[PDB]
Structure formats: C-alpha cells, structure tokens
Symmetry: C6
Subunit: 131 residues, 6 copies
C-alpha cells in the first residue's frame, strides 16, 4: 500500500497477511460469486492504493491460478492506445499492463499514472473475466 | 479512517469483528445502526471507507435500500427537501466523488454524506 | 482514546475492536456480576482516557441497552449542584452528563474538565446501577 | 506502559488486552502456582515500565481480588523508612505504596523514583504472598 | 524488512511472526507445490525488501532443512563473475551469497546492491531447486 | 526490541506476546531439538536487537528454568578478558554477562557494545548448553 506520511510524501507499507487472508475467508471464491470479490478488490484498489506488487499479492491470494490468468488475459485485452482506441499491439499492451515487474517509480507522475491505469485495467479485467 | 489530517484504511479485523458480533441489519437494524453511527464519528470514514462499512456489514439488498433512503433524504441549501437529480448526486453520490478531505468544501461534503447515510440507515430500519 | 504522542500533542485514536470484544468475552455480563465490568471500565476510563464518543462505544459494547440505560440514569442521579446536593435541574444534569454528543473540545481546559466529570459521573453510574 | 520517546521524553500508551489475556491464558493462576505469574509480572514490570494504573490493570486481570489484596498487603508490609527499618506510619506506607491513585508525574525525577519504588514493592508483594 | 522512511533513509523493522506463520499455513509446502511458495517468497522479497537475516527467517520458517539446503546450493550455483558468466570461485560465490551474516550496510550503494543481488540469487535458487 | 524509528535514533518497544507465544507453539522444546530454538533465538537476537531484559523474557518464555539455568552458566562460562582470552575472573564475568539487571544505556556507546557482547555470549551459551 501507498499513502501520505506526516510529510506529504507517499510512503510504502506492505499489506498485512491478516487482511489478505481475512478477505479470502470471509468471501466466496471468484467463480461462485465474482462480483463479491470484485467489489472488494475494487474498493481496496482505492483505499490501499496498491502498487504493481501489491496487486500481485492481492490477485495471487484471492484467486486460483487460472481465475487469475483469465483476469490478466482480460485486463490486457482491454488496453487502449494513445488515440483512446483499443490496441492489441504487443508493446503497448505490455506497457499498460505488464506481466513482469515494471520499473514504475511511484514518486513521479509517469509511474503514478501508470499505476492508475494498471488498476483501472485490472478492474476491467475482473469485470470482464466475471461476466 | 481520518484523524488529525491523516488517512488510513480500515483494518479488516475491525470490519469482520463488527459483522461477527452483531446480527444482520434485517434482524435488528438498531444494532448495526448504532455501531455504524458511532464509527461515523470515531473513525471519520471517507466515501470509500463508507463503501466498505456498508459492503461488509450489509447484504446487497439492504445496502441498496439504505442508499436509496439516504438519497431521498437529500436537501438543498435552504433546508428544504429536493430530488433534482444533480442535487442528489452532488450530496450523496453512488459513484466515487472527488472530495478533498484537506479543504472546507470536501470536509463539508463528507459530514453531509455521513448524516444522509445515517438518515438512510434509520429510515431503512422501518 | 486520548494520549500525548512521540513529540507531545494530546491526540486521538479509536478503540480497536479487539479490545472491546476481549473485554466483553473475558468477563461476565454486567448483570451476573457488576463488579467485574465496573472494575474494568474504571481502569479503561483512566488508561485510555476515552472521549464522549469513545464512552458510548464502551457502554454499547459491554452493556445490554437495558443495563446501559440504568447506568446513564444513575450517572444523572449522581450529578451535583454547586451546592453539593442532588440536582435534577434538567439543564444541570445535561451540562455534566449529556445523553447526546456534546461538542466538548478535548484540547482545552473546559473540555478536558467536562471529560473528567463525565467519567467520574459514569463510574458513579456503574457502581450505583450495581447497587 | 512507558518508554523513552524520540524527543527524549517518556511516552505513555495503554496495555493491549491481547497481551494481558495472553499472559493470563498461558499461565496457571497465582494461587495454583505463584512463581509463574510472579516471574511474568516481574519481567513486564521492566519491559513495559508500567504506571500505577497499569499495575492496577495488570494485577486486576491476572489475579483474583483476594490474591490481589494479599499481594497489596505484603507490598505495604515491605515498606521501609529512611532509617532502613520497617515503618507502619500510615503517611509513610501510603507515600511509597498507595492504594489510591497518586499523581506521580513520570516526566519528573521524584515521580520516576516513586514508580521505581512502587514496582520493587509490588514485586516484594507478589514474592512474599507466594511464599 | 526495509522500506523508505520519513527521513528519506531506509528503515528496518522485523517480520511479524503472524505474517510468517500465516504464510506457512495457507500454503502447500515447497515440495508439494514448490511454485506456490516461490511466488510468495518472490513477492515478499520485493514488497518487504528483506535483509540477509530476514531471508534466513523467511527460509527457515517456510522450508524444511532439506529444502533450505537445496535452495542454498542452487542459489550458490547461479552466481556470476564480473564478466556475466557462471563462477564457482569460492571468494566470488561467498561474496554474492554468503552462508553467514555479511555486513552489508543498506545506507550505501554497496550494501543495497548486495541486497538486490542476494535476493535475486535466492529467487534463482528457489526456482531451480523447485524444478 | 531495539530499532531506529523513521525519525532516525535507536528506539525501544517491548516484545508483543503474540510473537513470543507463536515462537513457543511453533517449535519443540529446547531439550527435544535444541537446534530449532537456538536457530530462532539467534535470528531474533539480530532482527530484534533485544535489550538485557528482552533477553530474559525471550529465554524465560521459550525455555524451562532448568534449560535457562544451563544456558546462562554456559554463557558465563564463555566470557573473555580484555586481552581476548578465556577469563573466569568474577569481576570480568559479571561485567560481560550479568546475572542481575545491569545499568546499560542503549542510547550510549558503551551500553550498545555491552549488549552486542551479551547477545554473542548468550548464543555461545545456547549452543554449548545445546550440545550436552
């Protein structure tokens, strides 16, 4: 998670495991009730302001391996180009929703915006994967 | 949660203890209502915090009623009731507002949001 | 709860839900044996230095609404006039022990003193409803 | 508890109920075997640097009322005067081991000395009541 | 664990035993499903930025003795020279993946770089011991 | 435990009982498998930078008094004098490995070094108590 510390600089702290496992146990799977976990992951995408890595923990914990692969397939299928329009160009798809840890520096506008896009794209991945 | 002015998300232990230690809102709306009401003051929740409070302690049916009721308690600046759609949406949005908790305008928007949500919890346990 | 920080300014933090239910689960109900939960609350009224709102949660969690109602009544019964006598003067009973949230400012002399009196009064109320 | 804050001033924070209840639940009762809770209390008295209130909380949670009174009586019996001898002068007994909340001030030397003394006596108390 | 502190220097805090035991209990062992613990350790290695000692705790808790020595062997079989190629030169292997506490200072490029490298080699180890 | 706060100076916080009871319940006793608990204690010794008191709590919680006795003798049995050699001169043994709470200020240099030393002897003690 990211938040402001008592100096107005963003500050990282990892998820506590308690929260992640609570979230798991107190909800049905993704397949039995996909909009339950989606509602939750979605709220958390804002409240906890998670990084790329934070998202991998969220996803890895709350989803089965192939629940997760669908989610990413779909997040990636939803990428848009500069032009506002869909793109499936491999390099733009990877730049918006990379599968391997990117180098987004969360203290710059570029990294923060990349993160904003990432979560939006993840969310759309969960929504599409569900329906 | 907010406190003096700093943000921190709810602990999930706290949201599930609250669920586990009370009955459903339908069995006993005055229970969860007194809890939420209090948490509205003590944890100074943001719109998203409110979403997790409601989403965790209410079934979808109940949340939707509560929300419907909060929205039909909305009032203009003269104190009189209103359902002009942009008046409602400004006071109790269903989608994420851009309220800034460091200012007057956002702080006020949040105090109003909590009041209405409570209005909505009261009127939906009847 | 209230306390001075790592650099000293009297600050606020909510009760942790764990503390409120641990207190509930390790003692008998108020009725069963009132001395336990009175002895407990007494302590917490000092170590945690609760706000008015903190006290509501405290009583809401540990007491049945019936019991709470008794206690609020006795806390009111115990309010004294400048003359040191019982006073049921409706406004007198409410300056000292408001049933509805007062805007006592904890960062100032009158608030902190209202707080003090509230807790004494509350403790008075707990014992009395035990007697 | 008390500890050395960043500003170099001692800083108060309440016990966590999970600490106290864990202490109770992982040890036999004082009457059933007094070394165990004595050794625990003795340690906690230094690591957590408890105020007078905190000790009330400790002793309250971990001992029955009738074990507490035995321990508090023994602690008083262990009071000593400026001449190194027992003293049962009540003003002397009550200055070293009060039964009613004192206003020792942990930010000052003499408050700090009183707290050191109180803690030593409380131990003496627990030790002799066990023997 | 380490993270960027309010002062702009890194800052250390040890693992909560809850995170480690929760990580143990909500997964298959390394042998049952080596890829599931690997994905977890890999993530934690980024999110928690563990020191050398941290990893010793991570590994000790999450793996048997057998599994740990296999991972430690492979981690050491993946060390590279200053030319980018494999090396079995003891001084180079030890320097990159020591079996005993180094003194890497994370307040310097030299120490941070050794932490990055050590983590990378540990991951390579898990992945290779796992296959 | 001791660590630097994000303000940057060496601050104290007590062990939480959860870690202590979790360390106890997820390992065997010292007598059944002294390696596991020694490995844990050794680790915690560096990660938690325990004060002298922290150590007593640590040892007391995880070891029987009998075990703790053994460990403390062996630790004392391993003190070294200022030349770098085994000393059993009682003033030197009590300076390095005090059986009674010593007057060590973790915000001072000599305080910190006394701890570093104390912890190393403590480990020698667990190890050596271990073997037997």
């Amino acid at each position: 998670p990211l938040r402001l510390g008592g100096n107005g600089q963003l500050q990282y702290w990892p998820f506590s495991s308690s929260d992640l496992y609570n979230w798991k146990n107190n909800n049905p799977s993704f397949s039995e009730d996909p909009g339950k976990l989606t509602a939750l992951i979605e709220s958390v995408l804002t409240t906890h302001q998670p990084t790329w890595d934070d998202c991998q923990q969220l996803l890895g914990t709350l989803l089965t391996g192939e629940e997760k692969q669908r989610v990413l397939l779909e997040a990636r299928k939803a990428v848009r180009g500069n032009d506002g329009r869909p793109t499936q160009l491999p390099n733009e798809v990877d730049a918006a929703f990379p599968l391997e840890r990117p180098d987004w520096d969360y203290t710059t506008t570029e990294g923060r915006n990349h993160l904003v896009l990432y979560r939006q794209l993840l969310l759309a991945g969960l929504q599409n994967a569900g329906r």
